[PDB]
Write a structure and sequence with these properties.
transport protein, Two pore calcium channel protein 2, lysosome, binds ligand EUJ, dimeric, homodimer, channel, mainly alpha, 621 residues, Helix Hairpins
Chain lengths: 621, 621
């Protein structure tokens, strides 16, 4: 009766959790299965991810207000400051929907699970501190300059995903060894700065403790490699040995040793993911069987209740129909535990179709089309005119560049661009009138060249409507999107398939890695605005300074300028110049900030990138 | 009779080849076993390696003659040019002993093996071309400037070793994939140099084909990261996207993909070495058994002939005595094939002894010494005064540096250096008078601190003989060797043993890796002297040039200046400056040379270094 219905909804939600690899640790009530099935629907989780993007996007429209044409200090516009309430309004709107997500996730799980899970307790702590800071910053009329509630904003991105949580555990185990290597690195610097100060000061670089300690720190990342040993190596040829040995021990041996420590915890990363996901699938279907054999009742289940329980799940139609036809043909005998676990192993095959074409009225007309459609060179006739188009844009690009840069002939360019895009629209039209509209949507390559033929047709016709033959600007935009045709050649990779397999493997596994990149940049940019906001002003410089080189755009005035400044220090080149600038402008203790950014970003994250490419290249072979 | 003796020498040379892991593919004659046993002796192979060092050392004393105080062009001495015949004389002396090595190695092996082995045929080819060039360069009175016979000199280093031959096979298999990645790299540069020339020229960097192609090539290795995008990013904030995407695809994705290709052929490198070496050992002892069972004869061998054949081999005395005592106790029954192969498995254990101490005459005196010798803190009392010594040298180093740099007090430094080295000589003396002279030689740490106490005693006493208390120079040399005492602290590594295990693993496996490094530097330096020998002369510069920065010491005038110039391009920093200098001074086509040096050294060899550290870190766990 009522227990009959409740075991159905118990067994629907268990199979649905066995497809999408979720654990079974939630309470089972009457109404809770409606709440659980609606919360894990894709329409509810998409607004949750859209919120997390909206929270992190608001740092572009805050009070420093990175909405400017440029980011120089010598010449830029006024900062558009918003009114008092709008950025406060959107933030408390999204902080409401984060409270709703926690309250649903606490209701669906146990209180004993709620007190033990550290991620849920940290979620409640961050929500109340962000709300306290919101009321404080609104009790004043938007006049608290530094807001702590923006620092906790990357925590919502971490708590939503699971691949970020797995990778942070992998860095947690590597930290006992990387500390010991960094200790050996600190011994390395302090010994050679005392050996250096005895040897040379007895330079421009070796004259003090903090000046000599910086010079060997910057040489450790080889940012001034010939510069730091010009005055030594010009006095005697033997002082080259001192700087050669420092960067063989330092940059070669110990920085590459630090990569291999991080790889040694990511060494079996993907195979643990398949073993855990298969273990979650087998536990889901077993719990579905064990509640279905105990409906009204040898051991086993009735297949009539199986037809009532595979009806109301979300699954592919090909997987739904093939599974239902197997169990329809099976008899009324009870299905054992082993027969149940083999039944749900039709979730391993993948089904692909493209489409069939449509028949025309004139039978010789459709015959002449399809015979001359399946040539396997009709596309290569498209590829021949594609290569012919790209070589023409290049060969005129060297012609218009060097000589007569003001006013050029530009006669035959419009002719070739006429005949090439006319050929593209015909190949667009002949393929749909052979296959069909749904058949042309079936191939993902054909969407790319079909859309590009459209946009090239709009820009060409508008070019031929203004003139007959800003003229240079329209031929600029026309030539730039023509070079996108060369991204049809690269989808033809027959011999070198390991490279194309790898780039497919990386982009499907960038949810974890980009998540840690975003969290690291978001914290360090926001600290940097609070420390170096207006410390660079401008109104015969030394030839290697921050001012001779016109580095005025690398400041921390707002959030967009901070992200590009922090990028230029991540690649380590010329970061001696940034250290010398902020030492002069914002005191001597600012070097703690740039050295910490070198550790978190350049050392750990780049070696975290190489470890992930090593694992995704070495998979199944 | 005579066949009795010949089977003995057959079975001596097979067991000796089964210890030192050499194959059995050589002919067996009467006199040839004397030749083979004398050629593989360590006194014959050491002069062969000393010759190979002597051939490669002669490039320092050749006609460019790198014997100068400095290597500037603004001020350096005259080149000491040697007479006509001496470098020719030493070369033909070593070319004689290479002919003797080939002739022995061809006599000991088969002619059919000689015609099939490619290394032996290349050996004969290089020897005759080096001899033809020697007679040609001596028919003129040392006036052929460029000598081809120096280019073939790294081939003798490759042919001698076997770890270099194994690693060159591993690079041979990776070359089909690295070419495909470099193709994808070349597509990457040519697309964005045409996209760049449309976008910006419609800069200082984007105005031509060869100027724009260099700018994106140098950005690929991030040698001008803020410099190439100053004028774009100052005009508009959106042009940062063009340069961010180029170095995410370029330097991040594709250069780290090129590491993982090389690692995928070194992935099982050391385990193949143990499996091949154990296979060479089992084949050696089996061939020893099969010729010993067929001396005069169920199956088996007589142990009396075993005592005659284990007598005349070279082996450790501990392994010799333990093996002989096992077979002495075994009876006169014939030893089977399985019993033979288990007999030679006492080459797996390793035996360590240090020494016993010696007794003194007064029994309470020796009792008081040894009781207060085994404290485990007598060494730490040495370690406490070691740390006390090193902190004192440091704390005065900041005191003498900053203020009053001309003439300093320098009063208490001689006092502390007196009492510390006096303590060291006593700890030197009390340990030998407790253990012994042979007991003090037993510990390799004690040789290091014992020798350092000696040299510190000579320099201190000579310091106290000139003065009472060049004075600053002697306190410089005294302070510098005192800092070597800190290399006693680092031999105490209890928690972080994986780091110390790895550095032990690297240095025992640097025969292969340094061999390819030496071969690469030797060829590219010698080509560079022949191309850019006198193209840099010197007699208001742009602020980022080769002349504003005083880079005058990075030339190719002789062999020592070439090696440091090629080093400064291996680390990729500021190599835009070198490209701009040699373009102005030695034509436009010189960039082919520096780009090829970027590929061989920076790309392949550094990734060859990371692959080897990855394999030696991941071994037995
Ligand atoms: C600098 C690096 C320092 C490392 C610090 C990070 C320490 C860290 O994450 O370990 C995990 C622990 C324990 O929490 P933890 O259990 O590790 O969190 C993960 C989730 O439980 C996940 O469940 P779902 O996502 O629902 O599937 C589960 O699969 C993973 O197990 P697995 O390994 O088998 O995949 C867990 O690793 O969680 C904290 O204690 C952080 C709490 C506050 C978060 C602050 C982080 C900013
Ligand atoms: C840029 C890289 C290009 C790669 C070019 C290098 C090509 C290359 O070495 O392959 C090996 C072949 C064949 O020669 P190869 O047999 O490979 O040479 C090795 C020796 O035979 C070695 O014997 P021992 O040293 O006496 O113990 C044996 O153990 C190795 O087998 P293993 O793999 O099982 O360890 C062999 O790899 O030898 C050549 O054909 C070069 C002849 C002229 C040398 C010119 C080299 C400058």
């Amino acid at each position: 009766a009522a227990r009959w219905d409740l075991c159905i909804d118990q067994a629907v939600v268990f199979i649905e959790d066995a497809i999408q690899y979720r654990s079974i640790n939630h309470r089972v009530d009457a109404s809770s299965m409606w709440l659980y099935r609606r919360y894990y629907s894709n329409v509810c989780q998409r607004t949750l991810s859209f919120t997390i993007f909206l929270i992190l996007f608001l740092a572009f429209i805050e009070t420093p207000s990175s909405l400017t044409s440029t980011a120089d200090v010598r010449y830029r516009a006024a900062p558009w400051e918003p009114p008092c309430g709008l950025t406060e309004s959107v933030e408390v709107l999204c902080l409401l929907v984060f409270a709703a997500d926690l309250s649903v996730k606490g209701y669906l799980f146990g209180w004993a699970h709620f007190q033990k899970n550290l991620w849920l307790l940290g979620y409640l702590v961050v929500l109340v501190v962000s709300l306290v800071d919101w009321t404080v910053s609104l009790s004043l009329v938007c006049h608290e300059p530094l807001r702590i509630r923006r620092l906790l904003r990357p925590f919502f991105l971490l708590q939503n995903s699971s691949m970020m949580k797995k990778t942070l555990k992998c860095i947690r185990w590597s930290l006992p060894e990387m500390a010991s290597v960094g200790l050996l690195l600190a011994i390395h610097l302090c010994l050679f700065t005392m050996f250096g100060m005895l040897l040379f000061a007895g330079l421009t670089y070796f004259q003090n403790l903090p000046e000599s300690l910086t010079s060997l720190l910057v040489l450790l990342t080889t940012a001034n490699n010939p510069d730091v040993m010009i005055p030594a190596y010009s006095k005697n040829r033997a002082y080259a040995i001192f700087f050669i040995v420092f960067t063989v021990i330092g940059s070669l041996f110990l920085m590459n040793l630090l990569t291999a420590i991080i790889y040694s915890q990511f060494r079996g990363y993907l195979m643990k993911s398949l073993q855990t996901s298969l273990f979650r699938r087998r536990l889901g279907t077993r719990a579905a069987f064990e509640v279905l054999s105990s409906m009204v009742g040898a051991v086993g289940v009735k297949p009539q209740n199986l037809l009532q329980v595979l009806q109301k799940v979300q699954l592919d139609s090909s997987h739904k129909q093939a599974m239902m036809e197997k169990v329809r043909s099976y008899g009324s005998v009870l299905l054992s535990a082993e027969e149940f676990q083999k039944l749900f192993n039709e979730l391993d095959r993948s089904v692909v179709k493209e489409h069939p074409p449509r028949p025309e009225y004139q039978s010789p007309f459709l015959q002449s089309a399809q015979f001359l459609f399946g040539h396997y060179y009709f596309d290569y006739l498209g590829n021949l005119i594609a290569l012919a188009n790209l070589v023409s844009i290049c060969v005129f690009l060297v012609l218009d560049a060097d000589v007569l840069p003001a006013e050029r002939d530009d006669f035959i360019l419009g002719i070739l661009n006429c005949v090439f895009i006319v050929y593209y629209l015909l190949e667009m039209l002949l393929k749909v009138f052979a296959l069909g509209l749904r058949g042309y949507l079936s191939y993902p390559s054909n969407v790319f060249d079909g859309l590009l033929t459209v946009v090239l047709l709009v820009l060409e016709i508008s070019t031929l409507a203004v003139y007959r033959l800003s003229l240079w600007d329209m031929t600029r935009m026309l030539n730039m999107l023509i070079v996108f045709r060369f991204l049809r050649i690269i989808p033809s990779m027959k011999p070198m398939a390991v490279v194309a397999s790898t780039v497919l493997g990386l982009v499907q596994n960038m949810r974890a890695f980009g998540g840690i990149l975003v969290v690291v940049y978001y914290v360090f940019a926001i600290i940097g605005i609070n420390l170096f906001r207006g410390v660079i002003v401008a109104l015969s410089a030394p030839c290697g300074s921050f001012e001779q080189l016109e580095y005025w755009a690398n400041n921390f005035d707002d959030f967009a300028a901070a992200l590009v400044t922090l990028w230029n220090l991540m690649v380590v080149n010329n970061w001696q110049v940034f250290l010398d600038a902020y030492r002069r402008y914002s005191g001597p203790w600012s070097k703690i900030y740039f050295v910490l950014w070198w550790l978190v970003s350049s050392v750990i994250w780049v070696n975290l990138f190489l470890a992930l490419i090593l694992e995704n290249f070495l998979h199944k072979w």
